[PDB]
Design a protein around this ligand. Structure first.
Ligand SMILES: *[C@@H]1O[C@H](CO[C@@H]2O[C@@H](C)[C@@H](O)[C@@H](O)[C@@H]2O)[C@@H](O[C@@H]2O[C@H](CO)[C@@H](O)[C@H](O)[C@H]2NC(C)=O)[C@H](O)[C@H]1NC(C)=O
Ligand SMILES: *[C@@H]1O[C@H](CO)[C@@H](O[C@@H]2O[C@H](CO)[C@@H](O)[C@H](O)[C@H]2NC(C)=O)[C@H](O)[C@H]1NC(C)=O
Ligand SMILES: *[C@@H]1O[C@H](CO)[C@@H](O[C@@H]2O[C@H](CO)[C@@H](O)[C@H](O)[C@H]2NC(C)=O)[C@H](O)[C@H]1NC(C)=O
Ligand SMILES: *[C@@H]1O[C@H](CO)[C@@H](O[C@@H]2O[C@H](CO)[C@@H](O)[C@H](O)[C@H]2NC(C)=O)[C@H](O)[C@H]1NC(C)=O
Ligand SMILES: *[C@@H]1O[C@H](CO)[C@@H](O)[C@H](O)[C@H]1NC(C)=O
Ligand SMILES: *[C@@H]1O[C@H](CO)[C@@H](O)[C@H](O)[C@H]1NC(C)=O
Ligand SMILES: *[C@@H]1O[C@H](CO)[C@@H](O)[C@H](O)[C@H]1NC(C)=O
Length: 249
């Protein structure tokens, strides 16, 4: 879904440290009973992207025509206490309202940042956003003015074993964090693309590293979920005309 670039590579997300059950626990969020069902939606696939760059130059990645965006992180150091995070910024476009999601770095050292709340949501109406000023200034002056600022705490205790994500339609926005989903009723004209900043220089809130893998989802996917005697398994469905009736009946 990305515009082609030389700094982005493909990885198998489940074949990583701590991601043994990253996607299974996401698919089994709603089907908590025993038996077999079929679930359909903009669910993540096996192959994700890991964009990185050796040099310390601000880089970008562009995702075109996507209806969902998911990412996963590594385990934060000293997760039981003063956890030190890793940075990541991405912007979901739209009119008249767009959303900037920023995960700052470091721990209980960033000035005027609430303790153990590494995540920031900036709901904005401004058209052109300067990312250098956003990721190079102090936290108190990052998202100010007439924009809406919502700090939030990513979970350091999960050790990066939970998937983070976002999905948007013309009438609802769903945010998946920890093992929960939160809804937002808003009428905005989404452009269905995301601009991701994955590499920059070290600054007041940014730390040069690569600890995230991301994926944009554009297609509808159907999974067969089978829960037998506590053993939970999922499989891809190929027959589209058969799984649309299996998920509805
Ligand atoms: C790992 O973090 C712990 C806990 O951090 C403390 O509690 C957090 C919730 C937050 O308020 C932090 O700012 C706190 O520091 C650290 O334990 C502290 O260690 C210092 C060492 O000088 C000690 O003075 C404090 O009393 C300790 N606090 C507690 C609550 O026990 C610990 O040092 C960190 N480990 C490493 C290796 O950095
Ligand atoms: C995301 O998609 C939007 C779709 O609106 C793109 O913005 C439009 O780009 C076209 C290019 O021909 C312009 O004609 C429109 O005026 C733009 N609309 C705006 C700016 O509201 C946007 O460029 C895309 N962003 C990407 C690919 O990063
Ligand atoms: C994405 O791929 C990059 C490749 O650059 C990985 O970077 C490696 O990170 C480790 C741990 O810090 C370093 O020791 C290696 O030297 C890096 N590899 C290089 C520079 O080629 C990065 O870990 C990957 N991101 C993940 C798996 O989340
Ligand atoms: C869900 O998984 C279970 C295994 O836990 C499958 O159970 C099999 O059922 C067949 C048909 O009765 C038996 O012959 C096999 O011995 C069972 N397998 C095991 C390992 O016990 C069950 O079929 C699966 N459901 C679907 C729809 O594939
Ligand atoms: C994922 O694993 C499969 C099976 O081994 C392999 O063919 C594929 O290349 C892997 N994808 C990667 C390494 O991006
Ligand atoms: C995360 O790891 C820590 C030790 O590093 C452990 O105490 C904690 O239970 C782990 N959390 C999960 C969800 O596995
Ligand atoms: C997504 O669906 C399109 C048709 O809309 C198809 O051509 C394409 O192969 C699909 N991509 C993936 C990754 O499944």
């Amino acid at each position: 879904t990305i515009k082609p670039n030389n700094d982005c590579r493909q990885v198998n997300v489940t074949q990583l440290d701590g991601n043994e059950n990253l996607i299974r626990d996401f698919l089994f969020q709603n089907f908590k009973e025993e038996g077999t069902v079929v679930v359909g939606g903009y669910y993540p696939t096996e192959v994700w992207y890991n964009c990185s760059k050796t040099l310390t130059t601000t880089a970008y990645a562009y995702f075109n025509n996507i209806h969902a965006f998911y990412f996963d992180m590594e385990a934060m150091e000293n997760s039981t206490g003063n956890a030190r995070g890793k940075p990541l910024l991405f912007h979901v476009h739209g009119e008249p309202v767009s959303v900037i999601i920023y995960i700052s770095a470091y721990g209980d050292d960033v000035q005027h940042r609430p303790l153990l709340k590494h995540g920031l949501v900036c709901i904005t109406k401004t058209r052109n956003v300067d990312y250098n000023s956003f990721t190079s200034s102090q936290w108190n002056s990052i998202c100010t003015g007439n924009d809406r600022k919502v700090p939030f705490s990513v979970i350091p205790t999960d050790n990066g074993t939970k998937i983070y994500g976002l999905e948007w339609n013309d009438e609802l926005v769903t945010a998946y964090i920890s093992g929960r989903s939160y809804n937002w009723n808003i009428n905005n004209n989404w452009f269905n693309n995301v601009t991701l900043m994955y590499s920059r220089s070290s600054t007041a809130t940014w730390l040069h590293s690569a600890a995230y893998v991301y994926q944009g989802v554009s297609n509808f996917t159907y999974y067969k979920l089978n829960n037998t005697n506590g053993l939970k398994t999922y499989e891809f469905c190929e027959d589209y005309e058969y799984c649309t009736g299996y998920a509805t009946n």
